Write a protein that binds this ligand. Structure first.
Ligand SMILES: *[C@@H]1O[C@H](CO)[C@@H](O[C@@H]2O[C@H](CO)[C@@H](O[C@@H]3O[C@H](CO[C@H]4O[C@H](CO)[C@@H](O)[C@H](O)[C@@H]4O)[C@@H](O)[C@H](O[C@H]4O[C@H](CO)[C@@H](O)[C@H](O)[C@@H]4O)[C@@H]3O)[C@H](O)[C@H]2NC(C)=O)[C@H](O)[C@H]1NC(C)=O
Ligand SMILES: *[C@@H]1O[C@H](CO)[C@@H](O[C@@H]2O[C@H](CO)[C@@H](O[C@@H]3O[C@H](CO[C@H]4O[C@H](CO)[C@@H](O)[C@H](O)[C@@H]4O)[C@@H](O)[C@H](O[C@H]4O[C@H](CO)[C@@H](O)[C@H](O)[C@@H]4O)[C@@H]3O)[C@H](O)[C@H]2NC(C)=O)[C@H](O)[C@H]1NC(C)=O
Ligand SMILES: *[C@@H]1O[C@H](CO)[C@@H](O[C@@H]2O[C@H](CO)[C@@H](O[C@@H]3O[C@H](CO[C@H]4O[C@H](CO)[C@@H](O)[C@H](O)[C@@H]4O)[C@@H](O)[C@H](O[C@H]4O[C@H](CO)[C@@H](O)[C@H](O)[C@@H]4O)[C@@H]3O)[C@H](O)[C@H]2NC(C)=O)[C@H](O)[C@H]1NC(C)=O
Ligand SMILES: *[C@@H]1O[C@H](CO)[C@@H](O[C@@H]2O[C@H](CO)[C@@H](O[C@@H]3O[C@H](CO[C@H]4O[C@H](CO)[C@@H](O)[C@H](O)[C@@H]4O)[C@@H](O)[C@H](O[C@H]4O[C@H](CO)[C@@H](O)[C@H](O)[C@@H]4O)[C@@H]3O)[C@H](O)[C@H]2NC(C)=O)[C@H](O)[C@H]1NC(C)=O
Ligand SMILES: *[C@@H]1O[C@H](CO)[C@@H](O[C@@H]2O[C@H](CO)[C@@H](O[C@@H]3O[C@H](CO[C@H]4O[C@H](CO)[C@@H](O)[C@H](O)[C@@H]4O)[C@@H](O)[C@H](O[C@H]4O[C@H](CO)[C@@H](O)[C@H](O)[C@@H]4O)[C@@H]3O)[C@H](O)[C@H]2NC(C)=O)[C@H](O)[C@H]1NC(C)=O
Ligand SMILES: *[C@@H]1O[C@H](CO)[C@@H](O[C@@H]2O[C@H](CO)[C@@H](O[C@@H]3O[C@H](CO[C@H]4O[C@H](CO)[C@@H](O)[C@H](O)[C@@H]4O)[C@@H](O)[C@H](O[C@H]4O[C@H](CO)[C@@H](O)[C@H](O)[C@@H]4O)[C@@H]3O)[C@H](O)[C@H]2NC(C)=O)[C@H](O)[C@H]1NC(C)=O
Ligand SMILES: *[C@@H]1O[C@H](CO)[C@@H](O[C@@H]2O[C@H](CO)[C@@H](O[C@@H]3O[C@H](CO[C@H]4O[C@H](CO)[C@@H](O)[C@H](O)[C@@H]4O)[C@@H](O)[C@H](O[C@H]4O[C@H](CO)[C@@H](O)[C@H](O)[C@@H]4O)[C@@H]3O)[C@H](O)[C@H]2NC(C)=O)[C@H](O)[C@H]1NC(C)=O
Ligand SMILES: *[C@@H]1O[C@H](CO)[C@@H](O[C@@H]2O[C@H](CO)[C@@H](O[C@@H]3O[C@H](CO[C@H]4O[C@H](CO)[C@@H](O)[C@H](O)[C@@H]4O)[C@@H](O)[C@H](O[C@H]4O[C@H](CO)[C@@H](O)[C@H](O)[C@@H]4O)[C@@H]3O)[C@H](O)[C@H]2NC(C)=O)[C@H](O)[C@H]1NC(C)=O
Ligand SMILES: *[C@@H]1O[C@H](CO)[C@@H](O[C@@H]2O[C@H](CO)[C@@H](O[C@@H]3O[C@H](CO)[C@@H](O)[C@H](O)[C@@H]3O)[C@H](O)[C@H]2NC(C)=O)[C@H](O)[C@H]1NC(C)=O
Ligand SMILES: *[C@@H]1O[C@H](CO)[C@@H](O[C@@H]2O[C@H](CO)[C@@H](O[C@@H]3O[C@H](CO)[C@@H](O)[C@H](O)[C@@H]3O)[C@H](O)[C@H]2NC(C)=O)[C@H](O)[C@H]1NC(C)=O
Ligand SMILES: *[C@@H]1O[C@H](CO)[C@@H](O[C@@H]2O[C@H](CO)[C@@H](O[C@@H]3O[C@H](CO)[C@@H](O)[C@H](O)[C@@H]3O)[C@H](O)[C@H]2NC(C)=O)[C@H](O)[C@H]1NC(C)=O
Ligand SMILES: *[C@@H]1O[C@H](CO)[C@@H](O[C@@H]2O[C@H](CO)[C@@H](O)[C@H](O)[C@H]2NC(C)=O)[C@H](O)[C@H]1NC(C)=O
Ligand SMILES: [K+]
Lengths: 134, 187, 134, 187, 134, 187
């Protein structure tokens, strides 16, 4: 699918995301991971061949504003650094990464958003089941 | 991380330095002091501070009336780019030059080698509600909780300074600064 | 899950909502029920330990504006009083409550939004099936 | 409600009075008259009415030019809080005091015991489109269909009055009023 | 379900959309197909019995603005003319139509958004399976 | 289109001529010239062009100062409707008549039979950033890439002309024009 480059991630290990999850970015939903990928794609195209003119299209202003207002209120917010996804290890199919929320200058513990990763895992498994039936 | 028998929780951390290296960014040292930097290679930064003290007097200092560019000395080689960053900051603050309090800047003959732009955000000087709007904009642009924090004069001072790494770069402040100034270049 | 207090509801009967549906509020979707729950949580925290500073984060301004624009046009709108949810009685699993639309100063009849509760009911049952298979 | 063999339609009705009891709220008597109330305990409300009749004359009355506070008498013990609610109403209407018509308020020596703020929303007096904006804002803020409803001059009059339970509280008008005035307090 | 009139479509063929897909328009999601249907419904009601006063409610301004920003950047955008839907031929049940994106004054080829119609097809089939089990 | 064994890709194309026939629409001939049309039955259109050349001089021509209606000759039978469309264009451009550069229009005694409205969008004449805003608004409203495209003076000329089918109708330009002017009619 879409393979992220070494410089994009701190880890420096190749991360290739399957086209179904990345396809979910094209939906009406405005995300924080999808925005960052759009920035990476714009930067790649710019290197091959301007950010001020495209910033409105690449970035969701409303989502950025709501995240910062969450930040100022000491509420868990998305600061656009870390993103968590559910990855079915055996098949390799994974959910669309979601922002790892941060509160009080510290990333939320896994338990603190347990439901968020619980339901996503269930949804992913459910989809896989349908693929077997289909 | 073991979500289940077959499911694992996994994360990826983003390095956005290279994407945002050549574009204006901002920081927060404390709820009062913030540094605005155009890009890594710049040796000069702009310091936006919320200060009780008064640095510029109307009688002895210049006023910004459609002539902000004259506040920066002609001899500096980054004069146009500095004025551009100043316009980036003012546009990011949603400043209305027509009606909001007239900014003051340093006299041309000042011995000190920093350009100083002072805005009076005290309730009496400004029209009602201006201090609230400006403080909320400072929180929105720099991540500060100054608006939530509780007659004392209040001022917004933007002075130029040498970039001595006063702050770690934040690409979210960079996104906010870019969104405020959209389709524009330094000038 | 999240149990609403007696004073919150007019009925005065305890209503506890399960964590999966309430987890669906954390998604990108902006809802009217989720906004009201955020207001209730803010009020509870304020009582334990300001609404003007947090109103933007707690309430979706765009959704409020579109609902009122629907109101002024004599179109069914959400006035933020009553919310309908699909509750599988035997298991207790329920859908995320949705705003009971109102038109001409009267709540819509159940039939007038039948599809909305029909499809929602189906989705809930479908999810339950997956839980059995998973 | 029996949706299916195993599924039931269920509803919950919200009581939001306690959440909104101590915060400014609004109501609608008819498409013309509106009452703005700070909170349940307050005994004074503000009446915003769209009236053809003229109550204040420019020659004999005062004009609001950065001195709105003087329109309310100093002797009332809720003077500052009343002026705060007036500022809430004007900010909620997105009023631009710099360019939008100059409001008129009652003379200081008036025998009548009401503070009256009169804004001329007739098309001739204001710049083109102002009447449309103000009427649409009134519908957005109070739920009125006055804008949709069909030369006759119109005025927007805000007078103070005793709270006589003229209307049931609505927490959605409260949400709209708060969203317009965000991060601010009465003053 | 909802049958579009002959003058609405260039094909001049009666196209009737089932109530489940059309029900998906009532959700929080702001779409481009749903907006156009709202415009058609408003036009029909106006004929039976004003567009300037209702334009804000009928049309999503944010979605229109983002589509225009994509257009100016030579990125695939929605110009509100053609819409693609996945239609299970045997049963006749179909997905909610989605905007056929256009780039460089030409409609995208089917392959250029293959994933978009792949996943939708899968989702549709999945729902049908549940209907058999339910 | 055969997606799968049981699934087909299907499309519907929308004809929006009848929905939008009686409402103001716009088109784009080239990145410089644009035609604004009230409706199909109108025989007159308005041409918005971004031109280097100067058509109106301040010394010999009239200035738009709250009297835009006088720019259109009284003898034309659609003068009020033409002025309404002009107000639609200006509102769509988010024009601030109070502070933005004063528009110029043809002298009353001009031999030429076209109303010309000239706005100076050169950087020097207007306040800083105005040219960027106006060009971005033109791109947003007419679909142009003039803002992205690279001292030469720049002008915005709105002249009236006979509708000669200079461009195909676009209902998305119609949606943009209507959203900009919401709750108003030509006048
Ligand atoms: C989103 O929010 C998260 C918070 O959850 C931020 O992530 C943190 O980012 C900070 C930088 O602001 C990181 O702190 C830095 O860590 C570096 C690693 O050295 C430390 O490593 C571990 C701690 O992780 C320790 O065991 C070890 O001893 C070291 O302390 C340091 O190099 C950095 O030091 C810099 O700052 C200090 C400040 O005192 C100076 O003294 C140093 O000279 C130097 O300048 C710094 O400490 C932190 O590790 C991150 N947290 C996590 C959990 O990873 C994201 O940055 C934030 N993103 C955005 C865009 O806002
Ligand atoms: C941006 O542009 C503004 C334009 O407003 C400049 O502000 C002016 O700066 C000039 C100097 O360049 C100063 O003018 C002074 O005016 C005094 C008399 O003016 C009276 O009236 C005006 C209003 O009409 C009041 O503001 C003012 O207080 C007075 O009441 C004179 O006394 C001054 O004379 C001084 O200079 C001359 C040399 O020119 C000496 O001979 C005198 O002895 C004395 O030292 C002077 O002319 C004044 O500060 C501003 N005037 C106005 C009308 O605003 C900003 O300087 C400029 N800023 C930047 C950053 O470019
Ligand atoms: C933040 O912004 C400030 C502006 O407020 C900058 O500070 C200015 O820096 C410039 C250099 O770029 C300084 O200009 C230089 O000043 C020197 C000394 O000033 C004397 O000038 C004459 C000397 O007789 C007298 O008036 C008096 O003694 C002054 O003290 C000059 O010697 C320099 O001249 C040299 O350069 C010019 C230009 O090329 C040549 O024409 C000359 O021949 C000569 O080579 C020059 O004029 C200026 O003085 C500083 N400001 C102030 C207010 O004085 C900061 O640099 C900037 N900081 C950052 C980090 O961006
Ligand atoms: C908020 O602040 C504004 C400031 O403008 C106040 O408006 C002024 O109020 C004062 C009274 O407080 C009045 O001043 C009067 O001015 C008259 C001449 O002004 C003419 O020109 C101005 C334009 O510049 C017009 O607005 C005005 O209508 C007139 O055409 C004088 O003739 C008046 O004199 C009267 O009073 C004096 C005693 O003070 C007597 O001796 C005279 O015989 C006569 O009775 C008077 O001085 C006037 O209403 C306003 N003037 C101006 C210039 O605006 C608002 O009242 C204030 N509002 C609140 C709520 O505080
Ligand atoms: C809506 O807003 C209006 C203001 O526009 C309020 O009406 C005012 O109410 C206040 C109450 O505080 C009134 O003030 C009181 O007025 C009394 C009568 O006023 C006379 O004052 C002198 C006396 O000769 C003369 O000019 C003339 O006869 C006036 O009629 C006074 O008796 C009161 O004075 C008492 O209190 C003060 C302060 O404590 C003391 O200094 C005195 O010694 C004395 O004890 C007082 O001034 C005011 O008059 C009213 N306005 C008008 C225009 O008449 C409404 O109350 C308000 N409504 C709501 C619901 O809030
Ligand atoms: C969304 O974006 C799509 C682009 O993908 C637009 O769809 C195109 O719309 C244009 C109109 O702007 C269509 O072009 C017109 O086609 C008509 C059909 O005649 C041609 O038919 C086929 C080509 O489809 C050829 O084989 C045949 O020989 C003909 O050429 C013509 O009648 C039109 O001609 C008009 O314009 C030309 C311009 O030179 C004049 O000379 C003519 O006199 C006449 O005025 C025109 O060529 C095009 O077919 C559409 N594309 C597709 C793939 O269907 C949507 O309109 C757009 N929607 C919005 C709302 O922006
Ligand atoms: C919308 O309304 C504006 C209002 O501003 C009109 O603009 C005025 O138009 C009039 C003509 O109708 C012109 O007035 C001229 O003024 C000259 C002197 O004015 C001086 O001062 C003003 C500022 O105060 C400066 O703008 C100006 O340049 C001058 O420095 C006179 O010389 C002129 O006289 C001419 O006409 C008279 C007949 O009336 C002849 O006898 C003379 O010989 C000579 O030909 C004239 O009076 C001027 O253009 C504008 N004035 C102002 C103050 O703005 C617009 O015309 C109107 N536009 C529309 C479309 O309706
Ligand atoms: C774009 O907008 C322009 C306006 O800027 C329109 O052009 C105007 O069109 C009108 C048509 O209504 C013209 O008005 C007519 O002009 C004729 C000639 O004007 C002369 O008038 C006197 C005659 O001596 C002299 O000053 C001089 O010779 C002028 O050239 C007149 O014959 C007409 O009068 C007739 O009608 C009126 C009213 O019904 C009667 O009172 C008369 O008795 C007579 O029957 C009339 O005034 C106007 O002249 C044009 N403008 C200019 C500047 O010339 C365009 O039509 C418009 N385009 C579109 C597509 O809408
Ligand atoms: C920034 O704005 C503040 C607020 O307007 C200014 O402070 C104000 O300064 C004026 C004098 O210029 C003070 O007025 C004086 O009040 C005293 C009584 O307090 C009175 O005796 C004097 O005759 C005079 O009227 C005003 O009180 C003061 N306000 C506050 C809140 O401190 C300040 O001057 C402005 N600074 C700059 C640099 O522009
Ligand atoms: C509120 O605004 C309206 C509209 O601007 C004002 O009405 C206007 O009143 C003036 C008088 O000052 C009228 O001017 C007169 O008009 C007649 C023609 O009918 C003429 O005989 C006179 O010579 C003079 O020009 C003006 O026409 C009228 N406008 C309208 C649209 O009716 C009203 O006075 C304002 N109210 C207040 C309290 O200021
Ligand atoms: C539209 O705005 C532009 C820019 O403001 C105007 O051009 C400006 O025209 C003035 C003349 O009034 C020029 O000033 C002259 O400049 C020359 C230097 O080349 C100098 O010799 C003269 O002493 C005088 O200062 C000004 O430079 C020029 N600006 C630019 C940027 O070219 C233009 O006239 C305006 N158009 C209309 C119709 O008003
Ligand atoms: C949209 O669907 C239409 C049918 O409504 C497709 O047009 C058909 O294409 C087939 C294959 O070439 C022809 O046999 C039919 O005659 C066409 N029908 C009509 C009415 O023109 C068309 O391919 C689709 N549009 C796309 C893919 O852009
Ligand atoms: K202004």
């Amino acid at each position: 699918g879409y393979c992220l480059e070494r410089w994009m991630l701190v880890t420096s290990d190749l991360k290739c995301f399957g086209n179904t999850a990345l396809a979910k970015c094209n939906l009406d939903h405005d995300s924080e991971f999808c925005d960052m990928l759009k920035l990476f794609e714009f930067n790649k195209k710019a290197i091959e061949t301007l950010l001020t003119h495209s910033i409105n299209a690449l970035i969701s202003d409303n989502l950025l504003m709501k995240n910062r207002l969450k930040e100022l209120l000491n509420t868990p917010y998305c600061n656009y650094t870390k993103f968590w996804y559910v990855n079915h290890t055996a098949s390799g199919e994974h959910s669309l990464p979601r922002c790892w929320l941060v509160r009080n200058n510290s990333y939320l513990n896994e338990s603190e958003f347990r439901n968020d990763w619980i339901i996503e895992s269930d949804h992913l498994l459910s989809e896989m089941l349908n693929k077997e039936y289909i | 991380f073991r979500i289940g028998r077959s499911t694992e929780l996994q994360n990826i951390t983003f390095d956005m330095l290279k994407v945002f290296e050549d574009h204006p960014t901002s920081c927060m040292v404390n709820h009062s002091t913030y540094y605005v930097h155009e890009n890594k290679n710049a040796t000069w930064c702009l310091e936006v501070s919320v200060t009780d003290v008064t640095l510029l007097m109307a009688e002895h200092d210049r006023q910004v009336l459609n002539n902000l560019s004259n506040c920066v000395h002609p001899a500096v080689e980054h004069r146009s780019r500095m004025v551009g960053l100043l316009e980036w900051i003012f546009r990011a603050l949603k400043y209305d030059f027509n009606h909001d309090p007239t900014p003051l800047c340093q006299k041309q003959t000042s011995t000190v080698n920093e350009t100083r732009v002072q805005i009076n955000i005290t309730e009496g000087f400004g029209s009602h509600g201006f201090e609230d709007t400006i403080l909320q904009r400072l929180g929105v642009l720099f991540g500060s909780r100054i608006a939530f924090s509780n007659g004392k004069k209040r001022f917004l001072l933007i002075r130029n300074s040498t970039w001595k790494n006063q702050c770690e770069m934040n690409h979210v402040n960079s996104m906010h600064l870019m969104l405020a100034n959209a389709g524009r270049s330094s000038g």
